[PDB]
Write a protein that binds this ligand. Structure first.
Ligand SMILES: Nc1ncnc2c1ncn2[C@@H]1O[C@H](COP(=O)(O)OP(=O)(O)OP(=O)(O)O)[C@@H](O)[C@H]1O
Length: 244
């Protein structure tokens, strides 16, 4: 009949609802909400949904489901599902991001249909270059996740902005170029995903001049490849760029 940060986090990660059974009335009666400070790790920002996203057997976590649901019934749902990591390492990350990272269609769908921002920028160190993509779109795109990419743009609940730009003004095409490392297998996949995107550049916005967008440096996706030295892809872009 009561719950604290750990109590919930415990069951969520344990992946059981018998101990979550009755979370709503606590929140109802205590007028506390999963959203406010108490139920977050100030260090990171892990909300109980975010713990759930990390802990999942075979891709399953029935917690996620009777959790967005308990969040929805408590007047905090858009706020709850878009919660990102307050830290400097995993800065932008939302529930949605992880679902895409973890290549989970069933979870990425049961998430945006509960109102996940499909424009949330993965702002942290984790996504940056030190050894892109940044946007749920550009991410799925770059991870080779076409089945999800389509779901993002062609979405009935919330369309992904196909011509969006991250910090450093990079679109999905830029992102792809940025990922081309010249391997037989790499060039192939980037080429395909590139093509596929431009094809959806027909059905959804036959009006958009997508090939022509400039990043913060001021390069077209082609112009990037030219300097970036991704010769394989540059050849594709140019070759296709002649209607076949
Ligand atoms: N977006 C992410 N992708 C992959 N791994 C992550 C991500 N965010 C956090 N992690 C890693 O996974 C762990 C988070 O999962 P979880 O909270 O279940 O860990 P835990 O062992 O239960 O407890 P703790 O959070 O104290 O480690 C972190 O230890 C972190 O190193």
């Amino acid at each position: 009949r009561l719950y604290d940060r750990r109590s919930i986090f415990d069951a969520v990660a344990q992946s059981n609802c018998q101990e979550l059974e009755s979370l709503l009335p606590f929140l109802q009666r205590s007028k506390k909400r999963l959203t406010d400070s108490e139920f977050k790790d100030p260090e990171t920002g892990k909300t109980c949904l975010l713990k759930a996203m990390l802990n999942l057997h075979n891709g399953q976590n029935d917690t996620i489901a009777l959790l967005l649901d308990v969040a929805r019934k408590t007047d905090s749902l858009k706020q709850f599902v878009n919660a990102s990591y307050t830290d400097s390492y995993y800065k932008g990350q939302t529930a949605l991001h992880i679902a895409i990272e973890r290549r989970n269609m069933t979870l990425v769908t049961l998430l945006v249909e509960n109102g996940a921002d499909v424009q949330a920028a993965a702002n942290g160190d984790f996504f940056k270059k030190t050894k892109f993509g940044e946007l749920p779109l550009s991410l799925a795109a770059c991870t080779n996740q076409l089945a999800i990419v389509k779901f993002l743009l062609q979405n009935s609940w919330q369309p992904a902005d196909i011509s969006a730009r991250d910090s450093v003004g990079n679109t999905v095409l830029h992102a792809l170029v940025e990922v081309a490392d010249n391997t037989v297998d790499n060039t192939k996949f980037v080429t395909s995903m590139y093509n596929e995107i431009l094809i959806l550049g027909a059905k959804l916005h036959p009006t958009l001049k997508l090939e022509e967008i400039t990043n913060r440096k001021g390069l077209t996706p082609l112009a990037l490849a030219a300097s970036s030295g991704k010769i394989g892809v540059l050849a594709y872009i140019l070759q296709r760029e002649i209607h076949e």
